[PDB]
Amino acid sequence: YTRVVWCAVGPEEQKKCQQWSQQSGQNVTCATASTTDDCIVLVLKGEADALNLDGGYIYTAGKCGLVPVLAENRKSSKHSSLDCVLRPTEGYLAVAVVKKANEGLTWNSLKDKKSCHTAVDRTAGWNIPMGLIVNQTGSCAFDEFFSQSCAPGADPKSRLCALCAGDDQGLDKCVPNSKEKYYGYTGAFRCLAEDVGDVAFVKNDTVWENTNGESTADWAKNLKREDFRLLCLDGTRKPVTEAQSCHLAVAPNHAVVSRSDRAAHVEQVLLHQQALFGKNGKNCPDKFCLFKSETKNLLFNDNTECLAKLGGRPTYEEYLGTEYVTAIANLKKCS
Amino acid sequence: LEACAF
Numbered sequence: 350y351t352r353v354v355w356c357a358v359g360p361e362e363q364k365k366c367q368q369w370s371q372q373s374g375q376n377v378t379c380a381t382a383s384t385t386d387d388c389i390v391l392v393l394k395g396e397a398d399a400l401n402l403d404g405g406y407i408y409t410a411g412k413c414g415l416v417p418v419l420a421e422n423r424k425s426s427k428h429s430s431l432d433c434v435l436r437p438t439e440g441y442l443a444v445a446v447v448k449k450a451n452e453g454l455t456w457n458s459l460k461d462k463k464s465c466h467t468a469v470d471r472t473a474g475w476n477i478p479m480g481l482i483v484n485q486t487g488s489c490a491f492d493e494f495f496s497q498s499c500a501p502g503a504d505p506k507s508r509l510c511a512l513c514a515g516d517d518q519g520l521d522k523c524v525p526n527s528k529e530k531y532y533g534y535t536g537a538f539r540c541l542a543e544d545v546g547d548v549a550f551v552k553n554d555t556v557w558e559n560t561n562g563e564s565t566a567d568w569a570k571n572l573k574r575e576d577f578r579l580l581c582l583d584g585t586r587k588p589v590t591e592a593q594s595c596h597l598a599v600a601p602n603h604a605v606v607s608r609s610d611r612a613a614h615v616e617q618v619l620l621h622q623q624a625l626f627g628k629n630g631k632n633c634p635d636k637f638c639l640f641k642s643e644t645k646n647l648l649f650n651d652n653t654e655c656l657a658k659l660g661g662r663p664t665y666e667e668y669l670g671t672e673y674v675t676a677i678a679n680l681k682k683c684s
Numbered sequence: 685l686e687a688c689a690f
C-alpha cells in the first residue's frame with residue numbers, strides 16, 4: 350500500500366477529487382492539470398498515478414505506454430447474476446442527435462451546418478463522426494466541413510471553436526475541461542438543446558439522462574425526449590428510443606489508465622475505494638459518492654455503477670479493439 | 685501509428 354495520486358482535469362474535478370481525498374483519509378490524493386493531455390503527461394512523469402479516460406484518450410495514453418486498469422460499467426441492459434465488478438463491459442452507443450423541429454436535417458445534409466462535440470480526440474464526440482465524415486467526403490479538410498462548431502481542444506480562433514462559450518465569465522472559451530459551458534457529453538448536448546448547434550455528437554445515454562425530468566439542472570429540466578431525433582447513417586431520422594438501430598458506432602467504455610508499474614496498486618486501491626464510495630458503497634450517500642457530481646460527469650461518468658475488472662490483462666489496443674484503433678489511426682493521418 | 689505524441 351501507498352497513496353494513489355489521481356489526476357483531475359480542471360477545477361471542478363479538482364474540487365471533487367479534494368473531497369474524495371479528504372474522505373479516503375489521504376489514501377487518494379490529487380494532482381490537477383488543465384487538459385486531459387496534460388494529466389496524461391503528469392502520469393508519464395510519475396507526478397500523478399491514474400485517471401479515468403474516454404477511449405480516444407486511452408489511445409493517446411496507450412501510445413505513450415500507459416495501460417488500462419479497470420473500466421466503467423453502467424447498468425447492464427440484459428440480466429446478470431454476475432457482480433458488477435466481474436461483469437463484461439458493454440460499450441456505449443455513439444449517436445448524432447438533432448432537434449425534431451429541424452426537419453430534413455439528416456446524416457446526408459450535415460455539410461455547412463453547426464455542430465457540437467464533446468472534445469477533439471474523444472470517441473463519440475470526435476473520432477467516430479469525423480472519421481466517418483473524412484472517409485465519406487474523401488477529404489482531410491474536416492475543419493471546413495461544418496460552418497461553425499464547438500469542439501473543445503481545437504484552436505480557439507478557428508471555426509471549430511466559434512460556438513464554444515467559455516466559463517461563467519466568458520473566459521477559457523474552448524478549453525477541453527468542464528469550465529467550458531459546452532464541454533463533454535452534457536455540454537455538447539446542452540449546445541444542441543440551446544440551438545447553438547444543429548447536431549450534437551454524444552452517446553445514447555446522454556439524451557436520456559438529460560431529458561424528461563432526469564436532470565433538474567436549469568438548462569435541462571424542461572427538455573422532452575420527443576423533441577429530439579437520432580441521425581442514422583442510412584439517411585433516416587429516428588426517435589431516441591431507437592439508438593440500437595440508429596448509431597454511428599459502439600464505443601469502448603471509459604477506463605482508468607496508469608503507468609504499467611503502478612497498475613496493480615492503483616487497481617487495489619480503487620476496488621477498495623468503490624467499496625466505500627461507489628454505488629451503494631458503505632459510505633455513499635452519507636459521506637461521499639465517487640460516481641455522482643450532479644450530472645457533470647466529474648472524474649467518472651455519473652451513470653457508472655462500478656469500475657470493473659478487465660478480462661485478459663488487455664493492452665490498450667486489445668481494450669479499444671482493432672477496428673477502433675485503425676479508425677483512429679486513419680483519422681490522425683489528416684493532422 | 686508511430687511514437688508517443690509527447
Ligand SMILES: *[C@@H]1O[C@H](CO)[C@@H](O[C@@H]2O[C@H](CO)[C@@H](O)[C@H](O)[C@H]2NC(C)=O)[C@H](O)[C@H]1NC(C)=O
Nearest residue numbers: 350351371372373374375376377618621622625
Ligand atoms: C486507507 O488505507 C489503509 C491501507 O490499506 C486502510 O487500512 C486497512 O484497513 C483494513 C480493512 O479494510 C485493515 O484490515 C488493515 O488493518 C488496514 N491495512 C493496512 C495495510 O494497514 C484504510 O482502511 C483506508 N481508509 C480509507 C478511508 O480509504
Ligand SMILES: *[C@@H]1O[C@H](CO)[C@@H](O[C@@H]2O[C@H](CO)[C@@H](O)[C@H](O)[C@H]2NC(C)=O)[C@H](O)[C@H]1NC(C)=O
Nearest residue numbers: 424425426427442553554557558563591592593
Ligand atoms: C440508451 O440510454 C438509456 C439511458 O441509459 C438506456 O435506458 C436505461 O436502460 C436501463 C435498462 O436497460 C434502465 O434500467 C434505465 O432505467 C434506463 N434509463 C433511463 C433514464 O430511462 C437505454 O436502454 C439505452 N438504449 C440503448 C439502445 O442502449
Ligand SMILES: *[C@@H]1O[C@H](CO)[C@@H](O[C@@H]2O[C@H](CO)[C@@H](O)[C@H](O)[C@H]2NC(C)=O)[C@H](O)[C@H]1NC(C)=O
Nearest residue numbers: 476477479480481484671672673675676677679
Ligand atoms: C475510414 O476508412 C478507413 C479506410 O477504409 C477504414 O480503415 C479500414 O478499416 C477496416 C475495418 O477495420 C480495415 O480492415 C482496414 O484495414 C482499414 N483500412 C485501412 C487503410 O487501414 C476506417 O475504419 C474508416 N473509419 C471509420 C470511422 O469507419
Ligand SMILES: Cc1ccc(-c2cc(C(F)(F)F)nn2-c2ccc(S(N)(=O)=O)cc2)cc1
Nearest residue numbers: 438439440601663667668669670671672673
Ligand atoms: C458490448 C461491447 C463492449 C465493448 C465493445 C468494443 C468495441 C470496440 C471497438 F473496436 F469497436 F472499439 N472495442 N471493444 C472492446 C474490445 C475488447 C475489450 S477487452 N480486450 O478488454 O476484452 C473491451 C472492449 C463492443 C461491444
Ligand SMILES: [Fe+3]
Nearest residue numbers: 403404472473
Ligand atoms: Fe466517450
Ligand SMILES: [Zn+2]
Nearest residue numbers: 596597598599
Ligand atoms: Zn452497430
Ligand SMILES: [Zn+2]
Nearest residue numbers: 661663664667
Ligand atoms: Zn492480450
